[model samples]
Target: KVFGRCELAAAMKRHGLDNYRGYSLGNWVCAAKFESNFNTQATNRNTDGSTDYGILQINSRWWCNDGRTPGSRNLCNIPCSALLSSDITASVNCAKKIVSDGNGMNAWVAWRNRCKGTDVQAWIRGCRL
Candidate 1:
């Protein structure tokens, strides 16, 4: 699990994700919180038999190859294991690609359900960054 909110924020900021594309830092922070509670190793097996990987919870069906899932588009062209690590650069890059593909944060069901249309300023409160 992440040490703290500020640590995640600082890393995101350092990776040039503080205000990536048109999305705000708060959006990224809120998405991470709801998706995996900032746990890098977080993985969830969905009812569809597909799994979501890492902090952003990228789906195995579209973004990565996990072998167990057949016919994945592998749009990110990386193993699902690549996302489940302390180095989140691959995950962040894939997320940005998802956003650029016109899905925005809606690609993440958690973001659409929890963060969309919500006031999320509190997500970044007291971070001082």
Candidate 2:
């Protein structure tokens, strides 16, 4: 499934991403913009052989267990496929755990490259959330 910017922003509120861990909703919006282009089925394979899954691109190596990542920790205790669900609940939950570990949204390089320190609030300016 795909999402427009405000569409994803509105959905994120119900999924508990608004102001999650001190990061504003727009921060997440911007991350999704770059990470997956708001694609629910977005997936990518890293050079290290680990995979990234779902809208937020949670890593199979550290978060979801795809059984292909070398010495995966499976910290999210779910299959990488689960992150691809259109519902996005599983992906959001795993993303929360990633941020809760003290990395904030910087766990995603996309967030670092584009979303960080760039007046993120504009991402959701008209969403009224």
Candidate 3:
């Protein structure tokens, strides 16, 4: 499923990402925009043969098991496929787990490169939180 800017923002807010791990909703919104363009089925392959899945682009190397990335921690305790669903429950839940693991929103490089230290409010300009 693909989401509009406001649609995604509302979802994130509903899921409590508005202040999750000290990140504002716009930080999550901006990260998701650059990471997966708000497409629930988005996936990206890493140089290490791992894969990232879902809107936040959760990685297979550590968060989810894809039966590929050797020594995958499977930290989310879920199969990588679960992260691809449009439901987003798995994605949001797993994202919170990621943040609790000391990564915060920085778990995704997109957040670091494009969101960190920036005013991400523009990412949700039309969204009513």
Candidate 4:
């Protein structure tokens, strides 16, 4: 299998942080599978003609506000591709900061729970973390 073991682990790490509190394990893995089929350098063809680039589906617009051109910096203002190359941690951290101050992880958790385990939105939504 191309995923084997190490590559799968790396891909998971690249897919998400903290297994999205464990619930996102399946979701992240599934999301990665759906997004790139495990190809790190893979890109996507959006219905709107936009392209999703890299292993994590870092869009060109996200990394570089120039729509098509990828900028050289990470977390550069809007899209921020530098998160992909320079600091994945920083990128995730930034995402955590911007998206509901880290509570957005609950959305992911809810997705995993609603589909797999228990409904986590109650706890996730009220969480102060």
What is every candidate's alpha-carbon RMSD to the true fold? 1.3, 1.0, 1.1, 8.7
Per-candidate TM equals 0.93, 0.96, 0.94, 0.44
Best by TM-score: 2
Candidate 2 lDDT, 40-120, residue by residue in tens: 999999999999998999998889998878898999989999988888889888999999999778899999998898999
Which 10-residue window of candidate 4 scores lowest in summed lDDT? 120-129
Q: Taking the tens digit of each residue's C-alpha lDDT, what string does model 3 give over 5-47?
A: 8988998888888888788888988998999999999999999
Clash pairs, model 1 backbone:
none
lDDT, candidate 1, equals 0.86
Instruction: Please rank every candidate by lDDT, starting with the best.
Output: 2, 3, 1, 4
lDDT score, residue 66, model 3?
A: 87
List, residue by residue over 1-129, the lDDT tens digit for candidate 4.
223223444444564643554444444444334444545545565565555553345444334343555344334365534433423343344434433434443333323344334442332232222
Model 3, runs deviating above 4 Å: none
- lDDT string for model 1 (73-127, tens) is 8999899999998989998889888888887788888889999888766777889
Better of 1 and 2 by lDDT: 2
Q: How many times do residue backbones clash in model 3?
A: 0
